[PDB]
Amino acid sequence: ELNEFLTRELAEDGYSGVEVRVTPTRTEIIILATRTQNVLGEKGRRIRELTAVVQKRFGFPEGSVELYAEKVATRGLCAIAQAESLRYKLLGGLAVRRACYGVLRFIMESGA
Amino acid sequence: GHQQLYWSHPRKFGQGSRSCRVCSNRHGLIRKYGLNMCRQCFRQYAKDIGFIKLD
Amino acid sequence: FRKFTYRGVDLDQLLDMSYEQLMQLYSARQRRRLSRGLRRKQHSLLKRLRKAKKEAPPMEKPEVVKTHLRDMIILPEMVGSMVGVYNGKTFNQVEIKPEMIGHYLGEFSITYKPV
Amino acid sequence: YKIPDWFLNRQKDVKDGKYSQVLANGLDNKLREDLERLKKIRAHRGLRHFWGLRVRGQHTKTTGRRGRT
Amino acid sequence: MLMPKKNRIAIYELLFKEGVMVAKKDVHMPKHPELADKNVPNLHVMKAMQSLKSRGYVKEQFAWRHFYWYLTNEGIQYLRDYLHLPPEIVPATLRR
Amino acid sequence: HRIRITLTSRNVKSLEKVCADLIRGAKEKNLKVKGPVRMPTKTLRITTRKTPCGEGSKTWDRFQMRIHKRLIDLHSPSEIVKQITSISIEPGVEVEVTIA
Amino acid sequence: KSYTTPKKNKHKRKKVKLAVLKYYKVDENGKISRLRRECPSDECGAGVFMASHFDRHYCGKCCLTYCF
RNA sequence: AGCGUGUGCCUACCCUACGCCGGCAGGCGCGGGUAACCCGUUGAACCCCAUUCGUGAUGGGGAUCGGGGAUUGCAAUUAUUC
RNA sequence: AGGAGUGGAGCCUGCGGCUUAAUUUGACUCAACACGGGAAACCUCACCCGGCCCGGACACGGACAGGAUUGACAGAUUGAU
Ligand SMILES: [Zn+2]
């Protein structure tokens, strides 16, 4: 549930994945994101409002979880980020061949 | 009226009492282990839950 | 020629008795039709039908009542009363006799045609 | 002779309701009476017996190929 | 779409107490489980919610069976004007 | 005071490493310890047809869920148990404690 | 679009003109008179002016009938 | 015998040993299991042993049909099932 | 080279065809026919008979607090109270 929701929500700022860690009285969720500036919004607004969504929909005591996000390392290796970038570049007006060549050269230059 | 017709026919059993939690359909639902998910959606999202192919 | 007896008893003595002995008088499957509890879930229409049948008619064949149901049990308290049964499409007129006691209602329906 | 009633063939008949074991010609006569009663009732079982089809609720699309021609 | 006066103000108070709002996609479920202190029809409140969407005051999200609603600056202006309160009131999502 | 803690996880190496770490810590604390009891694994099999439609050769899928349940017995006071639970927490292990 | 079998109409509420004038009878002084009934129910007080029937009167929200 | 499964989210519906009523399904006051703890040593069937049956559509086949008694759900007719 | 067999007998099931107010449909040699996880008494349901509150947001021009609304008890077709 959480993975699908985060993939659909944080697609606008380069979503990669999530790693839910469970700890009594304090649940620490970490989000695999590529663009940390767009995921925080305006000084932590996004974290608080998505947390409120979490308690309101899932149902959980308030003030116990804390949504987290950090810049992912070696983003060229994660295929999900490249697929999302290709979706962005093919969305508006880019040619299929040129865009595919660009993503291919970036992937093979990433170290794969 | 229709407000009385909402909770009129018993939605206790049969097949309309339950539905898939992904697409709100009522075919191929897996009630095993309380999945309540149809076969296609379970096949689609099986690896994320943890069920993976070893045999 | 030979006066019928319902399964041991005759019409008047059968009528002058309640369900608490009627149930043992007839068979088992229709006993559960009233043994689980009072019938009020979808039997408001059935009770309305009973009231309509017990309404005093003129000295002739009584009036006809149209219903969308085919799930009534034939009790003696409505024999000799005309009812319109919604046999899928039309409220077909039916004819009953005092030998109908203890049976179902919607068994007088022809599926398509004799062929 | 202390024989329980459930062991008998037909019990609590529609005619008299008494419990009696019936013999060959008696069974044939009672079957005729029951089928005539169903015919007079014009019940579903009686009419399906009249055309001579399966009355318990079976299928005919693939069953009953040795009857009418 | 006839809406009693008390239900609308109750839903406005429930929405403004935080920055977001949720509801399940099931019209055959009158009582709202989170708002257990009132017999609000969930179908009416979600339909008024999406009508407020159609007038364009909030963002809409929906994944499998639960909708997600998020406030906006113009949306919070509309809410504060309907509630007849000064703009000094802030939701729980804007505080540190 | 016969404390019995139950550990359930899907991965086997992580569970074995966590149990070994707990045993080493208890031994360094110089406390009586029991043997790590390994309950029989429970397999969850959900076999479904692979065809979204109903056309083609009848193929099938085989899904498995190998779960494990390792547990140890201790005769320690609960304060050290709470101190241990306050450290070395990972998502793989869902600790369940039974007091006896 | 149109159908084959004709359909009836939907019920409409006629314009209620001078409702208050129909509730209280005007006298030649400050005194007032009433020609309707008052609801003795616990949920609703005497503010619910029942309809002016001729056989038996009907309440507003109670769905109850008081006979003569 | 060996794989399984088991008290629920809108969801009540689980496996049930134990002692009775009755040929029989079936009916209540009685307990555990959220499971290597309880059903459960899962006393399975096919096997094995001693009569009955004796080439006879016959002690195989149970196709068709009537009546009676039962749990299920608001509801069993074209019998849900036994 | 062999074993079990099917096809012949009875019974359950899908398809085609005839019938039916309706008997919904997808797939037609391997690679369609106990296949859609579909063993359909009500929901299933997507077909016929019938009548229901509408589950027509919102923008514009009219209709309105001097009432635009909205829920109905005796009784009649109706299916219900
Ligand atoms: Zn009143």
mmCIF file of C-alpha atoms in Angstrom, chain A:
data_model
loop_
_atom_site.group_PDB
_atom_site.id
_atom_site.type_symbol
_atom_site.label_atom_id
_atom_site.label_comp_id
_atom_site.label_asym_id
_atom_site.label_seq_id
_atom_site.Cartn_x
_atom_site.Cartn_y
_atom_site.Cartn_z
ATOM 1 C CA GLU A 1 0.000 0.000 0.000
ATOM 2 C CA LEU A 2 2.665 2.478 1.069
ATOM 3 C CA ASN A 3 4.918 1.647 -1.896
ATOM 4 C CA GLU A 4 2.114 2.235 -4.408
ATOM 5 C CA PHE A 5 1.058 5.465 -2.700
ATOM 6 C CA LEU A 6 4.621 6.821 -2.650
ATOM 7 C CA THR A 7 5.282 5.822 -6.266
ATOM 8 C CA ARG A 8 2.173 7.677 -7.392
ATOM 9 C CA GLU A 9 2.682 10.690 -5.087
ATOM 10 C CA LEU A 10 6.439 11.351 -5.189
ATOM 11 C CA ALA A 11 6.719 10.614 -8.911
ATOM 12 C CA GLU A 12 6.888 14.387 -9.418
ATOM 13 C CA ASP A 13 10.255 14.577 -7.601
ATOM 14 C CA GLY A 14 12.077 11.409 -8.669
ATOM 15 C CA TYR A 15 10.846 8.546 -6.496
ATOM 16 C CA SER A 16 12.964 5.399 -6.171
ATOM 17 C CA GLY A 17 11.680 3.375 -3.225
ATOM 18 C CA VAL A 18 10.994 3.151 0.500
ATOM 19 C CA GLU A 19 12.431 1.227 3.458
ATOM 20 C CA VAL A 20 9.958 0.940 6.337
ATOM 21 C CA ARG A 21 11.643 0.265 9.690
ATOM 22 C CA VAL A 22 9.499 -0.728 12.682
ATOM 23 C CA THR A 23 10.549 0.224 16.221
ATOM 24 C CA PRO A 24 8.241 0.380 19.272
ATOM 25 C CA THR A 25 6.697 3.794 20.042
ATOM 26 C CA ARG A 26 8.776 5.354 17.228
ATOM 27 C CA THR A 27 8.476 4.225 13.601
ATOM 28 C CA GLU A 28 11.236 5.497 11.290
ATOM 29 C CA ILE A 29 10.316 5.551 7.599
ATOM 30 C CA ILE A 30 12.965 6.509 5.025
ATOM 31 C CA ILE A 31 12.099 7.420 1.426
ATOM 32 C CA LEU A 32 14.470 6.867 -1.504
ATOM 33 C CA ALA A 33 14.294 10.192 -3.349
ATOM 34 C CA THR A 34 16.528 11.828 -5.955
ATOM 35 C CA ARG A 35 15.489 15.495 -5.595
ATOM 36 C CA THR A 36 15.424 16.529 -1.930
ATOM 37 C CA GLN A 37 14.489 20.162 -2.627
ATOM 38 C CA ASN A 38 11.169 19.265 -4.275
ATOM 39 C CA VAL A 39 10.273 16.587 -1.700
ATOM 40 C CA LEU A 40 10.323 18.912 1.337
ATOM 41 C CA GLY A 41 8.171 21.665 -0.185
ATOM 42 C CA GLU A 42 8.450 24.751 2.032
ATOM 43 C CA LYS A 43 10.442 23.983 5.203
ATOM 44 C CA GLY A 44 9.120 20.533 6.036
ATOM 45 C CA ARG A 45 5.506 21.152 5.003
ATOM 46 C CA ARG A 46 5.394 18.031 2.821
ATOM 47 C CA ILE A 47 6.677 15.740 5.581
ATOM 48 C CA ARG A 48 4.105 16.941 8.114
ATOM 49 C CA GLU A 49 1.151 16.895 5.718
ATOM 50 C CA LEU A 50 1.959 13.437 4.322
ATOM 51 C CA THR A 51 2.387 12.218 7.903
ATOM 52 C CA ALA A 52 -1.074 13.590 8.706
ATOM 53 C CA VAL A 53 -2.380 11.736 5.647
ATOM 54 C CA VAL A 54 -0.771 8.591 7.061
ATOM 55 C CA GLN A 55 -2.478 8.807 10.458
ATOM 56 C CA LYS A 56 -5.795 9.867 8.930
ATOM 57 C CA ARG A 57 -5.935 7.027 6.383
ATOM 58 C CA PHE A 58 -4.028 4.108 7.932
ATOM 59 C CA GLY A 59 -4.963 4.998 11.509
ATOM 60 C CA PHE A 60 -2.190 5.483 14.060
ATOM 61 C CA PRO A 61 -1.519 7.509 17.227
ATOM 62 C CA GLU A 62 -0.514 11.058 16.355
ATOM 63 C CA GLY A 63 3.064 12.250 16.749
ATOM 64 C CA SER A 64 4.797 8.875 16.540
ATOM 65 C CA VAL A 65 6.110 8.487 12.977
ATOM 66 C CA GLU A 66 8.378 10.927 11.140
ATOM 67 C CA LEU A 67 8.606 10.750 7.351
ATOM 68 C CA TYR A 68 12.186 11.038 6.105
ATOM 69 C CA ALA A 69 13.838 11.607 2.738
ATOM 70 C CA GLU A 70 17.448 11.784 1.574
ATOM 71 C CA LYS A 71 19.327 12.089 -1.699
ATOM 72 C CA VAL A 72 20.043 8.674 -3.212
ATOM 73 C CA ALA A 73 23.623 7.788 -4.126
ATOM 74 C CA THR A 74 24.572 6.430 -7.563
ATOM 75 C CA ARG A 75 21.196 7.373 -9.034
ATOM 76 C CA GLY A 76 22.375 6.206 -12.465
ATOM 77 C CA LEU A 77 22.230 2.570 -11.351
ATOM 78 C CA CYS A 78 18.587 2.548 -10.200
ATOM 79 C CA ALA A 79 16.500 1.692 -13.267
ATOM 80 C CA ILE A 80 13.371 3.288 -11.771
ATOM 81 C CA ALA A 81 14.905 6.778 -11.826
ATOM 82 C CA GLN A 82 16.003 6.356 -15.449
ATOM 83 C CA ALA A 83 12.536 5.101 -16.418
ATOM 84 C CA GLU A 84 10.961 8.115 -14.703
ATOM 85 C CA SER A 85 13.364 10.499 -16.453
ATOM 86 C CA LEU A 86 12.577 8.877 -19.804
ATOM 87 C CA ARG A 87 8.875 9.345 -19.034
ATOM 88 C CA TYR A 88 9.507 13.040 -18.338
ATOM 89 C CA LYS A 89 11.533 13.562 -21.504
ATOM 90 C CA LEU A 90 9.111 11.663 -23.770
ATOM 91 C CA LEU A 91 6.109 13.372 -22.164
ATOM 92 C CA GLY A 92 6.440 16.783 -23.780
ATOM 93 C CA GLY A 93 8.091 16.807 -27.193
ATOM 94 C CA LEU A 94 11.358 14.898 -27.383
ATOM 95 C CA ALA A 95 12.158 12.455 -30.168
ATOM 96 C CA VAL A 96 12.168 8.777 -29.210
ATOM 97 C CA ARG A 97 15.563 8.013 -30.760
ATOM 98 C CA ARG A 98 17.419 11.026 -29.351
ATOM 99 C CA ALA A 99 15.946 10.578 -25.865
ATOM 100 C CA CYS A 100 16.702 6.850 -25.864
ATOM 101 C CA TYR A 101 20.279 7.550 -26.971
ATOM 102 C CA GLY A 102 20.677 10.116 -24.195
ATOM 103 C CA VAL A 103 19.407 7.813 -21.465
ATOM 104 C CA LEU A 104 21.500 4.953 -22.874
ATOM 105 C CA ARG A 105 24.717 6.984 -22.888
ATOM 106 C CA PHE A 106 24.034 8.240 -19.363
ATOM 107 C CA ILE A 107 23.423 4.690 -18.105
ATOM 108 C CA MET A 108 26.567 3.291 -19.735
ATOM 109 C CA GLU A 109 28.561 6.251 -18.387
ATOM 110 C CA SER A 110 27.158 5.752 -14.875
ATOM 111 C CA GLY A 111 29.412 2.704 -14.483
ATOM 112 C CA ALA A 112 27.208 -0.178 -15.600
#
